[PDB]
């Protein structure tokens, strides 16, 4: 069977880094000494084209994705299996994924924690307007006035969390100790918690003063936070998403801060990744980005290796994978 | 009473401003009082002032020279906390008041902190050059992007913020240690821990202990490399805590993989200070005492003050700085 991975370029002196072509997270060795072929892309597209004959089985993280469009499926008349090193697999066409017959599988739970840890930091960055602290740290300023402006505590704060889930979930643990109302809302996880008030769809986006995103990209949540949700959303509020780029207007989110009816946006993902340069998102008034790295902390690594490498094991030897792992069911 | 403020000029929702004052134009004149907002070339309202305010970071300066000119004045308000601005001793002779409002941020420093925990372990400085330079790395964000949980965290001194910093710690799933010259049992959130131990053992410690002669310099360069390698420090307690130069010899050779604090020697921070522009630094400068409600803290405090002066009230000692004949 041929393997074929595409991960981030190494680079001389970076000798942590798991997921890149160097340390390939292990699957070189793992793989060579199982009798396989494991091709390493630096390409994306176009060394990728080479490979689509006969790959069995490709792989790549969401952080930096080799897209399976229909276009490239149809050209691969051997791949069975595309994993996800990772979390997220809209680099894939489900569709045809599913109508020809590959299968469609990522490392849940590999990184929940991570992102948690990256959400509560954004918040936290956001509201207490670090941003503005490390500016004049650096250049030279010291002028409380202008920081003053816009830092808040987080306590007493209100904070929605759209979709309560395993990611929703550890960060109300973690919001919790810092003196604060939670509200979430979810379709399903629709009780009171320990931590959180259920709350509406229509309610938590007006009374949240801000809110995180925890929430998959289903086509409920595609474009959710359209012109008119931002819109809705209390005025000088933040926001913060994780989750997944698409869910977030990339256009009415730049309007909204603009305009200054959003106080602040972070998180880590975008539409689409990588993000090409100009990416008006980098660019913007008062944000928090960074790129998407938050479920790729060097621990989320072994995370993310061991379960390639645990899904590669089941996959040869026809042992079935844990629900947990796939998006699209295969024969 | 007239009551002058000398407060910057606004440009901002600040509260501390020739704007938004605190909410004294109103406050004051519903109750009859000569409201005056201000530049210090007004000397020309100190014969007959009977209460100045000003904030720490933009002070009126009451000097011998000028309270001996000042023969009306009652009661100097500090909105904020630090009269130095103030001559205490010409204060207390001519019988003016001078009070302070203990505004108080200790939850606050913690978040400053735990935020500066989690910048510098997460490698957010770098996930954020990245995103703004346009650059898609992740080889270089990721090379010492960490999660903070299962990390071990030394707290220097546990007093209400260090216990502050616990309790936002403890759910991040971390293992916590302390140093205390008096909490030395076991704390049902961090193990006690000799300081030789903390320094040695800790992946990141953050210190939150008092300016005393044994922290003077306490971080100096023989316990900087006594921490473990590309470990990290965070300090919104004191600059002086840490050896200005060592810290800088600390990152620059990469035995520290951060620093991160907002809390400098001396303050503010001359422009050209050297932890500004240090390597892997998550330093702002030091607001806090700053953030919108420590201004909604303060509007109330002076407000609650010039109302306990005005029904001729007793005050909390705790905001005397010179007591006076009303106080
Ligand atoms: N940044 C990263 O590196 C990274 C890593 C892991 C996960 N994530 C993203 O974070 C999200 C959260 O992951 P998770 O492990 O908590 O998944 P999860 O399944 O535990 O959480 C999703 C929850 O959202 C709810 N939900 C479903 N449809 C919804 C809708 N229309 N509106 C609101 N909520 C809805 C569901 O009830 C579900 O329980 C995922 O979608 C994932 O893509 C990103």
Same mark, same amino acid.
């Given at each position: 069977?041929?393997?074929?991975?595409?991960?981030?370029?190494?680079?001389?002196?970076?000798?942590?880094?798991?997921?890149?072509?160097?340390?390939?997270?292990?699957?070189?060795?793992?793989?060579?000494?199982?009798?396989?072929?494991?091709?390493?892309?630096?390409?994306?597209?176009?060394?990728?084209?080479?490979?689509?004959?006969?790959?069995?089985?490709?792989?790549?993280?969401?952080?930096?994705?080799?897209?399976?469009?229909?276009?490239?499926?149809?050209?691969?008349?051997?791949?069975?299996?595309?994993?996800?090193?990772?979390?997220?697999?809209?680099?894939?066409?489900?569709?045809?994924?599913?109508?020809?017959? !590959?299968?469609?599988?990522?490392?849940?739970? *590999?990184?929940? @924690? +991570?992102?948690? %840890?990256?959400?509560?930091?954004?918040?936290? #960055?956001?509201?207490?307007?670090?941003?503005?602290?490390?500016?004049?740290?650096?250049?030279?300023?010291?002028?409380?006035?202008?920081?003053?402006?816009?830092?808040?505590?987080?306590?007493?704060?209100?904070?929605?969390?759209?979709?309560?889930?395993?990611?929703?979930?550890?960060?109300?643990?973690?919001?919790?100790?810092?003196?604060?109302?939670?509200?979430?809302?979810?379709? !399903?996880?629709?009780?009171?918690?320990?931590? *959180?008030?259920? @709350? +509406?769809?229509? %309610?938590?986006?007006?009374?949240?003063?801000? #809110?995180?995103?925890?929430?998959?990209?289903?086509?409920?949540?595609?474009?959710?936070?359209?012109?008119?949700?931002?819109?809705?959303?209390?005025?000088?509020?933040?926001?913060?998403?994780?989750?997944?780029?698409?869910?977030?207007?990339?256009?009415?989110?730049?309007?909204?801060?603009?305009?200054?009816?959003?106080?602040?946006?972070?998180?880590?993902?975008?539409?689409?990744?990588?993000?090409?340069?100009?990416?008006?998102?980098?660019?913007?008034?008062?944000?928090?980005?960074?790129?998407?790295?938050?479920?790729?902390?060097?621990?989320?690594?072994?995370?993310?290796?061991?379960?390639?490498?645990?899904?590669?094991?089941?996959?040869?030897?026809?042992?079935?994978?844990?629900?947990?792992?796939?998006?699209?069911?295969?024969?």
């Amino acid at each position: 069977m041929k393997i074929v991975a595409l991960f981030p370029e190494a680079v001389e002196g970076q000798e942590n880094q798991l997921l890149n072509t160097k340390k390939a997270i292990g699957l070189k060795t793992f793989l060579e000494e199982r009798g396989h072929e494991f091709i390493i892309l630096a390409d994306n597209g176009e060394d990728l084209d080479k490979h689509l004959p006969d790959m069995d089985v490709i792989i790549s993280a969401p952080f930096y994705p080799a897209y399976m469009t229909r276009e490239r499926i149809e050209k691969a008349p051997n791949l069975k299996l595309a994993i996800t090193a990772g979390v997220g697999s809209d680099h894939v066409d489900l569709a045809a994924a599913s109508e020809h017959n !590959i299968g469609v599988v990522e490392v849940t739970g *590999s990184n929940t @924690v +991570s992102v948690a %840890e990256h959400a509560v930091m954004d918040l936290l #960055i956001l509201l207490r307007n670090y941003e503005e602290g490390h500016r004049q740290s650096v250049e030279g300023e010291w002028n409380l006035s202008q920081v003053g402006n816009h830092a808040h505590e987080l306590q007493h704060k209100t904070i929605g969390i759209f979709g309560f889930g395993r990611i929703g979930q550890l960060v109300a643990e973690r919001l919790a100790p810092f003196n604060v109302t939670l509200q979430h809302y979810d379709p !399903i996880n629709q009780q009171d918690h320990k931590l *959180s008030k259920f @709350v +509406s769809f229509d %309610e938590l986006v007006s009374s949240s003063d801000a #809110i995180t995103i925890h929430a998959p990209l289903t086509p409920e949540t595609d474009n959710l936070f359209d012109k008119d949700v931002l819109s809705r959303m209390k005025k000088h509020s933040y926001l913060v998403n994780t989750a997944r780029g698409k869910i977030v207007n990339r256009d009415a989110l730049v309007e909204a801060l603009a305009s200054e009816h959003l106080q602040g946006y972070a998180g880590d993902v975008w539409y689409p990744q990588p993000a090409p340069a100009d990416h008006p998102w980098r660019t913007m008034p008062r944000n928090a980005m960074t790129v998407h790295y938050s479920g790729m902390t060097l621990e989320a690594q072994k995370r993310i290796e061991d379960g390639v490498k645990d899904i590669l094991e089941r996959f040869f030897n026809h042992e079935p994978f844990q629900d947990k792992d796939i998006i699209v069911a295969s024969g």
